[PDB]
Design a protein around this ligand. Structure first.
Ligand SMILES: *[C@@H]1O[C@H](CO)[C@@H](O[C@@H]2O[C@H](CO)[C@@H](O[C@@H]3O[C@H](CO[C@H]4O[C@H](CO[C@H]5O[C@H](CO)[C@@H](O)[C@H](O)[C@@H]5O)[C@@H](O)[C@H](O[C@H]5O[C@H](CO)[C@@H](O)[C@H](O)[C@@H]5O)[C@@H]4O)[C@@H](O)[C@H](O[C@H]4O[C@H](CO)[C@@H](O)[C@H](O)[C@@H]4O)[C@@H]3O)[C@H](O)[C@H]2NC(C)=O)[C@H](O)[C@H]1NC(C)=O
Length: 288
């Protein structure tokens, strides 16, 4: 089966922690957009907001909503010990009802991009060197071996330019699949108006595939904002977000594993959410 879902943070746009009831309402609202629906959820961390290493409360919400989970461990900033502890506790506390929903586990999100020259200046925090990322991948594989998650596939999420950076080549060799992050909206060194969005997306995916050594490339993050500042030639608007949804999203949905960015984020700038904060009014026509 092909995964179709959304990316979800551990906090709300204002930075406050999300709890089980918040995740449950999101997962249910995503299902209620199309009656092959959005039934999957990608997370960036195993750790509940406001805690040191308590399992994120998205897990019990997903069990109740039967939501598929693409788990994430955050690998930058030296906190993998707590991520691994939370993963161990999640397996222990929630058992098979949890394991049965897990489609894969991503070790790190954009850690190689933050360890690049332009990524350093993004002020998104520190990154991780390829060798340490490989060691983290091996630690997670050891952690799930023998457990209910022993059949979950291990990947990593990063930008297409970090995948194509040949110094990062050994990371690919330790993964089961590659997670693609790419936004033509942010590619301001190119002619990145909405006019060129599909071309730029397709080109970046083909670049990632060229270094994937025949392993699957999942679309773990892309989207186009409805409001926000102009980036090069790219402008945020409901019309432009709609055009990107139609040109890039509709051909992916149900064909390539895809997690859109994102369901809802009112208050954030740029705002990438496709539904308003009532979790019912779409920002544009979502039919394909
Ligand atoms: C293509 O990809 C490659 C590889 O991914 C990428 O190359 C990296 O480029 C980035 C950006 O320029 C470099 O990051 C800088 O690294 C500076 C040096 O610190 C690093 O190197 C230290 C020494 O490394 C050698 O020695 C040790 C000990 O002998 C050995 O273990 C190593 O393997 C290596 O041989 C190393 O000690 C240091 O470790 C610290 O940081 C890591 C980060 O995860 C963390 O574990 C700890 O905090 C640890 O103390 C680190 O690995 C560094 O000074 C510099 O920091 C600047 O930026 C940050 C913010 O971004 C500021 O906070 C800071 O004040 C500085 O302004 C930055 O981190 C990295 O070294 C390259 N890696 C390699 C392998 O070459 C290319 O850029 C990519 N190409 C393009 C075009 O983007």
């Amino acid at each position: 089966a092909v995964s179709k879902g959304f990316n979800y943070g551990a906090t709300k746009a204002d930075g406050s922690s999300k709890y089980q009831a918040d995740f449950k309402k999101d997962f249910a609202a995503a299902k209620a957009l199309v009656e092959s629906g959005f039934t999957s959820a990608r997370l960036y961390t195993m750790i509940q907001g406001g805690t040191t290493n308590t399992p994120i409360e998205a897990i019990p919400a997903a069990i109740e909503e039967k939501t598929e989970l693409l788990l994430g461990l955050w690998a930058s900033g030296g906190n993998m010990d707590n991520e691994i502890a939370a993963l161990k506790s999640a397996i222990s506390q929630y058992g098979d009802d949890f394991a049965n929903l897990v489609v894969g586990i991503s070790v790190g999100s954009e850690d190689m991009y933050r360890n690049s020259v332009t990524g350093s200046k993004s002020n998104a925090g520190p990154g991780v060197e390829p060798e340490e990322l490989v060691s983290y991948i091996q630690q997670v594989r050891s952690t799930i071996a023998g457990t209910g998650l022993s059949d979950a596939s291990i990947g990593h999420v990063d930008t297409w330019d970090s995948w194509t950076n040949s110094s990062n080549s050994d990371v690919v060799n330790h993964l089961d699949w590659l997670g693609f992050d790419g936004y033509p909206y942010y590619q301001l060194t190119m002619e990145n108006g909405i006019e060129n969005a599909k071309k730029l997306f397709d080109e970046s995916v083909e670049k990632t595939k060229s270094v994937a050594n025949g392993k699957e490339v999942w679309i773990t993050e892309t989207g186009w904002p409805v409001t926000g500042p102009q980036e090069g030639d790219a402008t945020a608007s409901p019309a432009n977000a709609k055009t990107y949804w139609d040109e890039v999203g509709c051909p992916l949905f149900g064909n390539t594993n895809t997690w859109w960015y994102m369901l809802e984020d009112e208050g954030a700038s740029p705002s990438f959410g496709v539904v308003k904060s009532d979790l019912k009014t779409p920002q544009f026509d979502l039919s394909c």
